Amino acid sequence: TAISSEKVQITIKAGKEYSLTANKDVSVQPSPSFEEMCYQFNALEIDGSNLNFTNNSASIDVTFTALADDGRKLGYEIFNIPVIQKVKTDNALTLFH
Amino acid sequence: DTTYKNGTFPGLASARVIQTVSEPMDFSGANSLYFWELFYYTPMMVAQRLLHEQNFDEANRWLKYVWSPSGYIVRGQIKNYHWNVRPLLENTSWNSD
Amino acid sequence: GIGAYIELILDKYNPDIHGTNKSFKIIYGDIFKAGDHFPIYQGALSDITQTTVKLFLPRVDNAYGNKNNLYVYAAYQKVETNFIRFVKEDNNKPATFDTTYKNGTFPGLASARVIQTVSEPMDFSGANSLYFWELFYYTPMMVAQR
Amino acid sequence: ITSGLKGLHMAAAALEMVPNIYGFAVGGTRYGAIANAIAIGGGIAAEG
Amino acid sequence: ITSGLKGLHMAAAALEMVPNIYGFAVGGTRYGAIANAIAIGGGIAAEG
Amino acid sequence: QTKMMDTLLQSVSQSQLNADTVEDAFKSYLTSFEQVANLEVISAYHDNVNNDQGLTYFIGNSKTEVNQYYWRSVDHSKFNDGKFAANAWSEWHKIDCAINPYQSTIRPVIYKSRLYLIWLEQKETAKQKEDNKVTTDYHYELKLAHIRYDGTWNVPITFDVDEKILALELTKSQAPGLYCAGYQGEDTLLIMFYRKKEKLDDYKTAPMQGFYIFSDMSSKDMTNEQCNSYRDNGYTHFDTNSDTNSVIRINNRYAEDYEIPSLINHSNSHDWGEYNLSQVYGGNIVINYKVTSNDLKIYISPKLRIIHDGKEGRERIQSNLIKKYGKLGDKFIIYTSLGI
Amino acid sequence: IRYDGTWNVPITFDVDEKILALELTKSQAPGLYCAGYQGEDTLLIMFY
Amino acid sequence: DENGAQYMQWGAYRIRLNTLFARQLVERANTGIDTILSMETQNIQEPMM
């Protein structure tokens, strides 16, 4: 049942994987309890380049995961963040009576 | 209050959450009767009235908004919970006497 | 508004030229910017020269290429390449072909046509189409059933 | 004969927008003739 | 279609509060448009 | 089915049917068709930030006096091959609240995913100028009304804007331009007034009148150093001097160079671990983005949460047993094959 | 008129300029001339 | 409160009197009844007193 802070990690997919680990990014370790183990992370920069835009839209997936110390996994929780971009070359739509 | 424990912990164990702003809504507060009449009494009354008029599958899909025995599927994913009303998961006496 | 109705009958499906697929896309290009537009018509090929598509064709009165105001090519699976074009006068007199002896080559193209049409027959696919269906079909059916 | 008679009410409501007191006192027009006509039309449709 | 049409009456009642006679004679507004609209709403609810 | 066919069917819903009764019912249906076939579009509003996606709402005019304004919707996602398929459109719907614009100055707007109609309205007054005479004045007021869930319209909200319209330098019989857009981060209904010019690039220099509308329908006026950003971002959506055969445009929702949501709480997918003993669930990300050129600086703070609950059956109750007596970090032997 | 036989709400036009342009005494209506026109469909009207 | 809450300071007690549930219900109520009666709708949060 032991849970290392080293094997609680994040990858985020915005062009590349920016693999993050809780051991250096948790400010204060939560207390060992079966009920809730809340890990608060720090300010995490995401570089806006390397985002391809199809239909002027991009998406950034975050993968929460956790690994027990024996090697089994506690389960994952994948999220999804859309990024939508405004172009300038298109004018507004006119009505032509 | 930080010296090394101004406050002793004779029966106390720890201190926690810094970061929460909003709280989940209460089914025990002032507006709680309207929440009950929205979430529980409305599908029950619709389902009873549809049952007495021999219209069956519509009564079944109205009962499934409350208690699905087969589990709920939201956007492809089967959810964990088995009851659809939240104070049924967590018993909350909202009438003392 | 101002523009033309033109029709481009297309050549027969030779897979020597048309590639493996009978699917094609006619395209629009060269307006509003120097980039590429997208499908003013999409259809399919046949062994008979069956593709004959009467298309309205929109025009800003001041095109950026003033030498010849409007350009269309035809793309498909194998070859999708850049051709030369048409030209409309600024007059109400409608458009001809951009005339040297074929600026625009006709690799799968056959001919260019109608100058003289002003109005078009109404559409049962447009915005008001539901009201046209409820007028012409659903009303005599419902009267006759009743 | 109910006729869409709300058009006939809206005739009066549109006809009563203009100010009628002239001279020094200017104005005096009703402003709510429109919504009152829409109200009596909403009643007359239910009766029909 | 009875729609809570008392809202549509109260639109007119709220819209008719302002004084319309301007110039020297100031005022001229109805004051009882509100209670009259509440009255016609109380009637229309019973009819519904 | 429209209500046109409904009142036709109701017109023919009886037993004794003569042909001429059917004829008169058909003439009534024909008049009701005539009424909505002549509809004219005053103005419109686009939903999404860019033209390729989202919806679009139109506002209809009739060729009658005091108008029964209509609205319909259309999607841009069902567009393909140079033409909307006919299911991408919607039916016209009737608007019930009494609306009387000036010079047909009215735009719809989608604030907090609810349709709002906003328009300008003009009342004539008369001040006393009296050395001799009585002068005539106009004052302008602003209205705002929104739809309810069932389809009825609320009583409109009054705002006095004669100060700001008097601030703009306007001749008579010319309505000021109106600009109105939604705004997702910092949810606040934008509104800007402007004199109509002939050129779009003239509006980069035109001073602006406008304010903000919060969730409480309270106003806050624009400071011009704040309005400079909005004017520099959205100068292309303004309108020219609109005579007949002149240029009137549509409005998108407002955003600058990138549009990013602030917080996520709902999961997109999650999963049980091995042996269905525990799972990672209930996480959330707050997002702070900074906008600068040739990049984007997104700053997130994901808050992970690990719980310990079993799947229903033997797993939840073995999770409860291993929750009670043992502490976190111990080793346990659990038994899968439990039969009678 | 409409198709079924009902009448529309009338359209307003202000013509005090042109009637004031004609030199008219009181209690005498100006003549009115009004005709259709097929080519170039346009409702003719002349005061005199 | 600034953020939209209201409460009565009953000595040391703060007790909530209204809620912003109808504000944030509008987004959920857009697409149909199924979304309205979800567990997800039931977990909409209310700001700090």
| Cross-chain Cβ contact B84/H37 below 8 Å | yes
- Distance, CA of F266 to CA of F247 (rounded, Å): 43
d(CA C50, CA C27): 18
The residue with tokens 């006119």 is A94
Chain D neighbors of E8, CB-CB under 8 A: 35, 38-39, 42
Distance of residue E45 Cα from the nearest chain D Cα, in angstroms: 12
Backbone angles phi, psi at B87, to 5 degrees: -70, 0
Q: What sign for the dihedral angle of Cα A43, A48, A50, A54? A: positive
Return the partners of chain A (3 or more C-beta pairs < 8 Å).
B, C, F
End-to-end Cα, chain D, rounded Å? 10
d(CA A48, CA F144): 39
Give F141's strand partners: F121, F160
Substitution target in F80, F232, F254, F278 with the highest count of A β-carbons within 10 Å is F278
Please give the DSSP secondary-structure letter assigned to residue B39. Answer: I
Cβ-proximal residues to F316 (8 Å cutoff; 6+ apart), any chain = F309, F310
Technique used to solve these coordinates: cryo-EM
Nearest to F280 by CA among F308, F260, F302, F300: F308
User: CB–CB of B19 and A40 under 8 A?
Assistant: yes
Q: String of b and e for B46-61 (b: at least 16 CB within 10 Å)?
A: ebeebeeeeeeeebee
| E contact residues 4-23, partner F, Cβ 8 Å cutoff | 4, 7-8, 10-12, 14-15, 18, 22-23
In whole angstroms, give the CA distance from residue C36 to residue C41.
Answer: 14
Name which of G4, G6, G8 is nearest F64 (Cβ-Cβ).
G8
In contact, F42 and F250? CB cutoff 8 Å: no
Whether F54 and F255 have beta carbons less than 8 Å apart is answered as: no
| Shortest distance, CA G11 to any CA of chain D (angstroms) | 10
Closest CB to F285: pick one of A43, A55, A62.
A62
Instruction: Output the six-digit token pair for A3.
Output: 């849970």
- H13: its two tokens: 């007690």
* Whether H48 and B23 lie within 8 Å, measured CB to CB: yes
Radius of gyration of chain G (CA): 15
| 3-state secondary structure at position A14 | strand
CA angle H27, H30, H35 (to 5 degrees): 85
The tokens describing F268, both together, are 């997109």
Contact C141, F1 (CB under 8 A): no
Task: Give the nearest partner residue to A96 out of C1, C32, C33, using CB atoms.
Answer: C1
CB contacts of G9 in chain F (<8 Å) are 64-66
F112–H23: do the CB atoms touch at under 8 Å?
yes
If you measure CA to CA, which chain B residue comes closest to A28?
B16
Cβ-based contacts of E22 with chain F (< 8 Å): 125-127
Resolution in angstroms, to 1 decimal, for this deposition? 4.0
DSSP assignments along C80-115, one per residue: ------EE--SSSS--EE-TTTTSS--SSB------
- The CA distance from C69 to C58, in Å, is 11
Q: List beta partners, residue F297.
A: A47, F290
Q: What angle do CA F237, F168, F177 make, to 5 degrees?
A: 30
Residue at token pair 């950034």? A60
Name beta bridge partners: F128.
F134
Q: Do chains A and F touch (3 or more CB pairs under 8 A)?
A: yes
Q: Which of B19, B76, B82 faces F312 most closely, judged by CB atoms? A: B82
- Which tokens is C23 given? 């699917």
Q: Give dist(CA B10, CA A61) in Å, integer.
A: 45
How many residues can be counted in chain G?
Answer: 48
Answer for the pair F179, F196: CB distance below 8 angstroms, yes or no: no
SS3 of chain F: the string is: CCHHHHHHHHHCCCCCCCHHHHHHHHHHHHHHHHHHHCCEEEEEEECCCCCCCCEEEEEEECCCCCCCCEEEEEECCCEECCEECCCCECCCEECCCCCCCCCCCEEEEEECCEEEEEEEEEEEECCECCCCCECCEEEEEEEEEEECCCCCECCCEEEECHHHHHHCCCCCCCCCEEEEECCCCCCCEEEEEECCECCHHHHHCCCCEEEEECCCCCEEECCHHHHHHHHHHCHHHCCECCCCCCCEECCCCCCCCEECCCEECCCCEECECHHHCCEECCCEEEEEEEEECCEEEEEEEEEEEEECCCCCCHHHHHHHHHHHCCCCCCCCCCCCCCCC
Q: Which chains touch C (3 or more CB pairs under 8 A)?
A: A, F
- Cα angle value E24/E29/E34 (rounded, 5°): 165
Element (H, E) at C139: helix C139-145
Contacts of F332 in chain A (CB under 8 A): 1
Residues 6+ apart with CB under 8 A from F261: A81, A82, F184, F185, F287
Return the amino acid letter for B3: T
Whether the Cβ atoms of residue F219 and residue F160 lie closer than 8 Å to each other: no
Match 């589990």 to its residue by tokens: B71
Q: How buried is G39 (Cβ within 10 angstroms: 0-12 exposed, 13-18 middle, 19+ buried)?
A: exposed
